[PDB]
Design a protein around this ligand. Structure first.
Ligand SMILES: N=CN[C@@H](CCC(=O)O)C(=O)O
Ligand SMILES: [Cl-]
Ligand SMILES: [Fe+3]
Ligand SMILES: [Fe+3]
Ligand SMILES: [Mg+2]
Lengths: 404, 404
């Protein structure tokens, strides 16, 4: 199966090229769902000059398909209630009393079947897909008991069978401490987190192991127990770090050569250097920053100076970032974090793929990788970061197949 | 022609009711594109018990169609270039040599034919319509000469003939001075604004007269000349006031019974009370606030205390607020301005209609009004304000006809 997409402008994001690796008057040759060639039409090899199908892109811009490397897309119910209450002046105690807080998502997730969780997640997944997103990371963490933590991963896997999308999962039992384990974090990790990890891996339900290292969650030492267990099984690790305070989570992740450290509002210069040194991706999440009304900005310049690679994701979840637009995410990255257009585009493609350990597989328009790309009805790539609440997608191609 | 909408929950926003006028197990009776009945299905009059059509809404929520009372939706080109340039550290002088600044929109709007402007606006209009919006206000203001200003109004009128939407226009020649009138605000008003208003009115192209009272634009005395002229021709006025400084534009607007005063970041107590006393709606625009990285928040509490009605709009424009989601606008209203869920829902329905002088015609699900409503896939109205970058619209009804 071969196909050609000619008369296009490519934003290859090939790391060997400057900027976003733009190629004018280009073509993408595809074979068996793989990129056989991506460059100047004048350089297309003879053996690739003909194909079963040919699409005239009319000079539109093509970028690698977008990637959302950090989401909690799977969960039951919503958290609109406390949102409204808080806006009415409700106290943290009053909301809790009313059933709000992370416990709300845990209860609603625990209460639903696989089938219903899939049903509730699809609208969110489709919203992302509609924007050209073809690779999405989904975490567990709204179960807090082995059975529910496992059910979440199961649902994530199932979603991949219902849509043309690449889904990777992250075991996140170490997200919070459930009620029946209050004040017993060590026992929680002993009875649920670790045993849950063994079980998830044995079923092939976990691609990576995540964690929440924060004063309101788990400590560096407690997360260390989890990462040690994952490392022994060959599972890559990632971590929600320095979101609400500076604890040293970023540094812990680096020492374990984690795929990424996410949030990072309170990350310091030492942590930034450590992440870069280890090749750990710094995932910034503007949605939560925005919704929580956070005042501490992540150290973008420090990351730049350290040579750390920055990614951007939606952190799509029910309580701190009910965001379902990665295009909007880029606009926030630029507007709120002052990231350049180049950084924003790289953050949702090349760096997003690296944060998932999929760079050799997808994320850029390079020969040898999966033919995953998005065709945009724009004159300039900057348009994808500039507009607020607009979708200029013209077409999405997943593994060489135009899907809609 | 008749039709019934059964098994639904209604958010009537009837001002005579508490909150957003919610009604459980309700029905909507439509007759000749008008609302004959809206309320408890048990209170439905026998003479309406039947109709040609009947729709089971499956328990979904219904709200009056959304209204965007402040937009510059019509314009040629885009401003993505300067957006990218600013983030790269480009200075105002460098952006100007590259063709940036409001002059870019004026140049592009002047160069494009009526047809092409209509075509470039359709995608923005359609994005809003896809969100349940059925009434949109469109301003001129990117021409700065009589012919282009009038062209903009004609384009706006024509858009209403291509989609099921109610469009109201605002003559905004008093937006800024073009290159040849810099330092000559007086002559600009004398040569373009006033004669232009006369011609616009003669052709029935302007539903209202707008203006920009600001340091970088027109003074209070200058806008007064324009409002005086609008009054003599029987046209209502509105004003972009107190956006960057406090000049007393809001008070001037109130003295003319302005439909609304818009932006208001720098509005003081005196001004807030003046708007309330005059019945002028306070239109807050979070998009521009967000994009400009504004530090001065509008006096939300002062407005509440003075009893001023608040509306929310996208201010959809190329340079300061390229926003095309009114749903996102409500979320920003809550997130950035701390407006309650009830204030946000009211801000895009009842108060928006009032901002346009159309409350007797639409904006609430009340008998006698136009049958304009949106059916949503939500469990609670709060969801429409709570989510970020999501569209739960099920169906849009315009003048009693199901369109989307
Ligand atoms: N809404 C819940 N998700 C959050 C949990 C953070 C917290 O417990 O404060 C998250 O993914 O980080
Ligand atoms: Cl074209
Ligand atoms: Fe998260
Ligand atoms: Fe405006
Ligand atoms: Mg095009």
């Amino acid at each position: 199966a071969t196909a050609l997409w000619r008369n296009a402008q490519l934003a290859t994001l090939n790391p060997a090229m400057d900027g976003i690796g733009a190629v004018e008057n280009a073509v993408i040759a595809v074979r068996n769902g793989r990129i056989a060639f991506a460059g100047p039409e004048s350089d297309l090899p003879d053996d690739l000059s003909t194909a079963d199908e040919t699409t005239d892109c009319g000079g539109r811009w093509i970028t690698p398909a977008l990637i959302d490397c950090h989401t909690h897309l799977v969960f039951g119910g919503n958290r609109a209630m406390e949102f409204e209450m808080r806006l009415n002046g409700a106290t943290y105690e009053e909301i809790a009393k009313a059933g709000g807080g992370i416990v709300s998502s845990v209860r609603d997730t625990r209460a639903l079947s696989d089938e219903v969780l899939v049903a509730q997640a699809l609208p969110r997944l489709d919203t992302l897909l509609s924007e050209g997103v073809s690779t999405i990371e989904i975490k567990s963490g709204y179960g807090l008991d082995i059975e529910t933590e496992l059910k979440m991963l199961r649902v994530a896997r199932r979603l991949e069978t219902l849509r043309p999308v690449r889904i990777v999962t992250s075991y996140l039992a170490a997200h919070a401490t459930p009620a029946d384990y209050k004040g017993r974090n060590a026992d929680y990790i002993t009875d649920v987190v670790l045993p849950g990890l063994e079980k998830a891996h044995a079923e092939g339900l976990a691609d990576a192991v995540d964690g929440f290292c924060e004063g309101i969650a788990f400590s560096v030492k407690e997360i260390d127990r989890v990462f040690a267990a994952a490392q022994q099984r060959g599972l890559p690790v990632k971590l929600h770090a320095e979101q609400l305070s500076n604890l040293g989570g970023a540094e812990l992740a680096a020492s374990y050569n984690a795929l990424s450290a996410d949030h990072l509002e309170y990350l310091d210069e030492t942590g930034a250097k450590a992440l870069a040194k280890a090749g750990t991706v710094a995932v910034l999440l503007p949605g939560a920053f925005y919704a929580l009304r956070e005042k501490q900005l992540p150290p973008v310049q420090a990351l730049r100076d350290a040579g750390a690679e920055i990614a951007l994701a939606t952190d799509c979840n029910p309580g701190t970032s009910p965001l379902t637009s990665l295009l909007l995410t880029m606009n926030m990255g630029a507007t709120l974090f002052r990231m350049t257009v180049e950084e924003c585009l790289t953050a949702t493609t090349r760096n997003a793929a690296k944060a998932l350990g999929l760079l050799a597989e997808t994320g850029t328009l390079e020969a040898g990788k999966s033919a995953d790309f998005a065709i945009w009805d724009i004159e300039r790539p900057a348009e994808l970061v500039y507009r607020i609440g607009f979708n200029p997608l013209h077409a999405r191609i997943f593994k060489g197949q135009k899907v809609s």
